[PDB]
Specification:
The chain is mainly beta. It has no helices and three strands. The chain has a three-stranded antiparallel beta sheet, with no helix packed on it. One of its GO terms (biological process) is defense response to bacterium.
């Protein structure tokens, strides 16, 4: 459960697509933590 707030990564719903790499999870099972390349 990482907020990804320090990394500045954006959270994505369901799962992280290819444009964004899923580092783990935004915080809840509703969305996932994603980061722009």
């Amino acid at each position: 459960p990482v907020t990804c707030l320090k990394s500045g990564a954006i959270c994505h719903p369901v799962f992280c697509p290819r444009r964004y790499k899923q580092i783990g999870t935004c915080g809840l099972p509703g969305t996932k933590c994603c980061k722009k390349p």
